[PDB]
């Protein structure tokens, strides 16, 4: 069961100075159109065949939506399931500068999905600790060129995911920080983030940040057995696909693009399999990194939420068209 959202960030000053116009438009609460701008010395077109193309999503947002509104429309509903033992996943997807980190982390003035979700999580827990015992743990790490960082413990840089007795993949050694408040979770991500590989030339356009929250629930009634539940929420902020011909990436850079492109392909192969057929033959989780971690999650009785991001800027038309196509339902 998959949900796909598209977020349009407001246009930027840098874009206006480059001379960009608005070509992306929320038309509808779940429809976005993308105007084609134009540029000679062609076109042999007009003969347009658009001009304008439409795109539909489970939900859509532009600058009118607040942080809280995107939270409420994307991930709030996941919470009930997670504390009940079900698994869930939220991706921020899109090109660099289109909004991923803002949607997921937010700012002090404007908090994103991480904290709004952690918040309703702890309230949901209290509202039901009459009946239930709960344990909550969260971690915040980085995957950069298939190499982990933990974001906390400084001594590991190559963690390999291992299977338990029931074939469930899970990162081995991955630190696990106990968090008793929202102010602590934010500090952990801010203190650990600095570790996230940045642009050798700013964060690296190749850095996944994974926030994972684990929740164990058992009954307070002891004279009746009942299953002990364990839900796992993954909240992920990634980078963008790189056309290596452009950029002209070499060595550390050249190889860097090969990975990101590989991981995004793998991910695309996994979500495509989950969306369609069908036993299956087994959904290709074994494709690559970021997948080893998400293996036991993302399956039959688990939820996925993808939030695609674009610029509304004319100067971004090609990227936006790729994004809209990819996420387009």
Numbering used by the authors: 11 to 211, 215 to 342
Q: What does the primary publication say about this deposited structure?
A:
KIF19A, a kinesin-8 sub-family member, is unique in that it possesses both functions, MT-based active motility toward the plus-end and MT depolymerizing activity. We recently reported that KIF19A functions as a MT-depolymerizing kinesin in the control of cilium length. Thus, to elucidate the molecular mechanism of the dual KIF19A functions, we performed crystal structure analysis of the mouse KIF19A motor domain as well as cryo-electron microscopy (cryo-EM) reconstruction of the KIF19A motor domain complexed with a MT. In the catalytic core of KIF19A, the KIF19A-specific feature of adopting two different interfaces for MTs and tubulins is utilized to achieve the dual functions.
Finally, we performed cryo-EM analysis of KIF19A in the nucleotide-free state complexed with a GDP-taxol MT. Cryo-EM reconstruction at a 7.0 Å resolution clarified the interactions between KIF19A specific structures and a straight MT. It should be noted that, presumably because of the weak or unstable interaction between KIF19A and a straight MT, stable and full decoration of KIF19A on the GDP-taxol MT was uncommon; the occupancy of KIF19A is thus lower than that of a tubulin-dimer in our reconstruction. Thus, we finally created an atomic model of KIF19A-free on a MT that has the similar L8 and switch II conformations as KIF5-free and the similar L2 conformation as KIF19A-ADP. The L8 of KIF19A-free on a MT moves to interact with H12 residues of β-tubulin during binding with the MT-lattice and the release of ADP from the catalytic core. This movement is accompanied by approximately 7 degree counter-clockwise rotation of the following helix α3, as also reported in kinesin-13. The switch II α4-L12-α5 of KIF19A-free is retracted to take a similar conformation to that of KIF5-free during MT-lattice binding and ADP release. The length, the location, and the angle of α4 in KIF5-free fit perfectly to the corresponding cryo-EM density of KIF19A-free. This means that KIF19A is able to adjust the switch II conformation to fit the straight tubulin interface on the MT-lattice. When KIF19A is on the MT-lattice, therefore, loop L2 interacts with α-tubulin through the hydrophobic tip and basic cluster, though the acidic cluster will not contribute to the interaction with the MT.
